[PDB]
Amino acid sequence: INAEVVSVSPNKLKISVDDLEELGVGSYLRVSDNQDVALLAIIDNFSIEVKESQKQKYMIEASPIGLVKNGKFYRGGDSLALPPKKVEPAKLDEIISIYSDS
Amino acid sequence: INAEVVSVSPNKLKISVDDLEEFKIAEEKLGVGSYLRVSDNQDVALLAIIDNFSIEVKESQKQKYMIEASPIGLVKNGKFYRGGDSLALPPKKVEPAKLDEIISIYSDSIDINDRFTFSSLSLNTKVSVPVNGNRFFNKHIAIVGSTGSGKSHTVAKILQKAVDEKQEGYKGLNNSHIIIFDIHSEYENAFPNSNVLNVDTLTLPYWLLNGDELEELFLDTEANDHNQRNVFRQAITLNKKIHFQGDPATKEIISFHSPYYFDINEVINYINNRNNERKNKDNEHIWSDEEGNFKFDNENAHRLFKENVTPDGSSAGALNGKLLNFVDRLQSKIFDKRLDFILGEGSKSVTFKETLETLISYGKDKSNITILDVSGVPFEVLSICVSLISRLIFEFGYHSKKIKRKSNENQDIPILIVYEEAHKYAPKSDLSKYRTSKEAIERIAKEGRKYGVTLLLASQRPSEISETIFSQCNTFISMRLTNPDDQNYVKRLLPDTVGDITNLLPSLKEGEALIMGDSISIPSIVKIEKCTIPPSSIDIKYLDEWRKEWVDSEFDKIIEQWS
Amino acid sequence: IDINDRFTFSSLSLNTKVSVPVNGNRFFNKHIAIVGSTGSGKSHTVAKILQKAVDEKQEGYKGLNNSHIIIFDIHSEYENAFPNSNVLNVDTLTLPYWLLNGDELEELFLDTEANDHNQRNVFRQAITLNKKIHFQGDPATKEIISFHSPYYFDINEVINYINNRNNERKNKDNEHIWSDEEGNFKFDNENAHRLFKENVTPDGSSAGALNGKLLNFVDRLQSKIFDKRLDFILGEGSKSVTFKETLETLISYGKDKSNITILDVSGVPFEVLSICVSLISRLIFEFGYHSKKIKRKSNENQDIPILIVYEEAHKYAPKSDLSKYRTSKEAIERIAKEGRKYGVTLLLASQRPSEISETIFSQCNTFISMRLTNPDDQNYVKRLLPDTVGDITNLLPSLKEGEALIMGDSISIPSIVKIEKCTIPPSSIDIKYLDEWRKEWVDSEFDKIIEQWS
Amino acid sequence: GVTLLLASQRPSEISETIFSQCNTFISMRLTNPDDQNYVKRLLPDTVGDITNLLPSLKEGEALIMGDSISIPSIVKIEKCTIPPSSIDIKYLDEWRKEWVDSEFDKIIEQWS
């Protein structure tokens, strides 16, 4: 598991990750290589879980802060906008469109 | 097969799926707030809204996504009944709710003539969400949202739809009557046919202010003695009797709080003439006038209002020089150019009928929406003029119900008073300076339901509104509210909510609402329709005016205006 | 439940065939608390219980039974529910002002924020003095009479006394000399009843120290006496009404006797609503309190059990300790904490139970709870419920319309019941705003309203 | 250059913000279950079955982890030639002695 959301609360997104090496409170969760559909989430807190049977995994509480479509940013959280998940080198300047487009 | 229930709580439903991507099937938007249809047999189904998504791993099989669902009600051949049913069982088939079943949530409970459609469901834009338009307006609306959420667009769209609501038997203005108190001059752009009244054109006569509003307009609560208050209401009440041209038995009815005509310039003379009073050896205030010589008695106190009064008496009076704090205070306010709309010469000359012809817009230029632009009104008198108009509209509606009760045929003039920035006038604090507009709005809220004068609270900070006024609203259209103190105020005050949609308040999209009340069939997350003519407030473009090269030609022109 | 003791107004939600009787004796004499949010049909189960209670009769006679229900509806809902009931709005109900005690007589007339303590001292000196002259018993009982005592006084004479005390002057002997048509005298406690006449001329070349301090007092009092909204409490009809005729009107024992008396308090001004609710609640409680005195002596009790229905019970008995609702809350609290044994019980009805005070909500024993979607109303009710069965009190936001959760001593066991469908529903005649707004611009109406105002 | 050293026998009472900043964690026998759950949750690094060895540690046998050490391990600290012994009032040694009576009068004079 690279990075995948495991719980979609109305105002929260719980994402379980194996390790921090595999940022901080208030950082923007941008791992996106999809055009015209993406999800933007800020980090509420970093939490560590107790499983007693597996390796410890970091759980991040993510508040959804917006949704971008072809470079246009709309505020408010939508749960629809993460069907894909793939590991490849992606761009970084799509966080510009959060503030620059409006 | 794909989706099945795995637990049936008293309040909740646990639904486990194996593939959410197949579960969408029709490519309907699926998320928190989406409707699930849980049934194995057609034409009878339980509709459940989604609280939260989850995952589970059996450690030896494929992972399964688990959905927390709140049963909102069961449908039965086009009839929707709220509340969870007994059909929710673990051997059941769950699927996204069909278009004919979601439409039946809202369309079945409201008659075809009673539907007031101004929005559509956020998760499903194909289904429109009507409200019971009779119950929507007659019980007060509370539109709540943070800045940048397009709350003013929601207020504008509801009033634009109410004005556009019409019967096909005529073409022209309908019977919609909306009064808007905008401090930001925002709704002028929204309604091009509206009647906008600012300080330049609004003429509010001062003599309909009651005792409470007359105190705060003229005197202060910190530096005036009780003697200065006493001489004020002596002059006001005595002035209201001579100008009363009606029945002399009704002359004794008149008190300080009565809304009858008085001349403030003649009141100025009384406090001036009592400022330079002189007493005699018998403590009798003899007065010398061009008309004649007289003492200060109740039966001849009306002739003291003339400015040609010379004081008489060998010694200075007891209250001689006592009113110089008072006369100079009120002489500043009558000739203050910022109070021309309320203390000017036009306030005396205008009549009672022309005031209500202006506030309700029943004069020459009849308009459905009357916009009271209170941006130019000074903030020290803002809560007084808001209280004056809110009292003038209520007692219009209170006296509206007395005419046609006798006649037995009621034409009726329903009035909706929109309070933009509603916590400015009706606050949580019980300060005396906001006291007049608080009980005037509270009279609309607690009593105006039955007299045809209701209110719309459009505020950016709902936590500052008083609970005795905010709870009297029944339908609540909450936009994106992210402040924890405004959420905790609203979440405590909302009368009816389905599971976990209330938590969606900080994460709402722009134009996306959260509407409840007696009007709507169920609390749903709706997307308000986009305004063709948006309520864009005209404001100074500071960055544009910064890069203006410093022409400084206008300053020499400004001082001539000041002089 | 014994067969003659059953009061069936509902059947089980999960099984329509089984009826759910309650011990109707124990259901009513211990106070009810019907609670349910908007759209849950809370007004229908209040309507159905009272419709079942009115029609609950014996087979030995045909006519009215001994049901005595008083409804406080600000929303004007129950007029259509009971067509045979007595409805009293402002225009018909005539509540005398002199039946108010000391606490209600201040907030009707005065404000604590602006009135100085010496100003208020003139008010209850005038009323207490006025309450003795108009009292027509022996002079020994006149010493008992105080400000808080409920006897007849004339508010116009109190108005004159307060206005005359604004004209108090002293002579060289420092006495408040008053010149009257009957005679010339100083202000004395023996001859202070002649100060009630308006034909009193002030005397003394030097005015009093407290002279002119009561204009903020009398002008506040001037407006309320001739206020057209307060005509029902401060009009000429409140002077002419008798003590018996007020109690005849409140429980419908006049010429038109009805089981249910409906107090349409919609037209009551919101500043005096907590005073008229407190006045009627105290009048009915003291009616039941003084009902038990004779019947003990008679040795066979005929009884008038009274159930006062407080629709929107959070407005009259709120959780907030504010002095505006202090009079109505204490009058409801006296009925809750004492009216069980005097035959004056209460039915609290509210869409927001969390605003009712817990000292009054807990005094109810049987709670009928409809849909409670508001989370603070759920947490309040689940805390105050005296009974439960496992995980049925978590069913509150998922209850249907007309489906209730009823517990207490009346019922055998807490259960989710389905209240019977109200054949005559409590419809409220409210202005259909859209149905008027789709009509064309009416312009002949606005001219007529202006002539009403003048 | 001002660095600290949080030495405490009740680690769970220390606030998390202060405690987590320290990154080298030398731990002796920790046997309070609330103390163990606090430390093992606040660990920067872990090896599967060596954090559970904390209540079974010997006398002077320590668990030291952090970026300074190469790998987490269960170590034995060298025995102190001069141990940090605190001089205290030996209650049972004094209570076994005879009733001291002259010393009560001397205390009150100092107090007065």
Author numbering:
A (entry chain F): 7 to 28, 36 to 115
B (entry chain A): 7 to 569
C (entry chain B): 116 to 569
D (entry chain E): 458 to 569
Question: What do the authors say?
Answer:
Here, we biochemically and structurally characterize a two-component defense system DUF4297–HerA, demonstrating that DUF4297–HerA confers resistance against phage infection by cooperatively cleaving dsDNA and hydrolyzing ATP. DUF4297 encodes a protein containing an N-terminal DUF4297 domain (a putative PD-(D/E)xK-family nuclease) with predicted yet-to-be biochemically characterized nuclease activity and a C-terminal domain (CTD) with unknown function. The enzymatic activities and anti-phage defense function of the DUF4297–HerA system are activated through supramolecular assembly.
We first determined the cryo-EM structure of HerA alone at an overall resolution of 3.14 Å. The single HerA molecule adopts an elongated structure. Unexpectedly, HerA assembles into a split spiral hexamer with a cleft between the topmost and bottommost subunits. This is in remarkable contrast to previously determined structures of HerA homologs, which form a planar symmetric hexamer. The C-terminal hook docks into the surface grooves of the neighboring subunit to strengthen the HerA oligomerization; however, this interaction is disrupted between the topmost and bottommost subunits, destabilizing the hexamer formation. Interestingly, HerA alone shows extremely low ATPase activity. Structural comparison immediately explains why the ATPase activity of HerA alone is inhibited. However, the required conformational change would cause a steric clash at the insertion and four-helix bundle domains, hindering the required movement of the R finger.
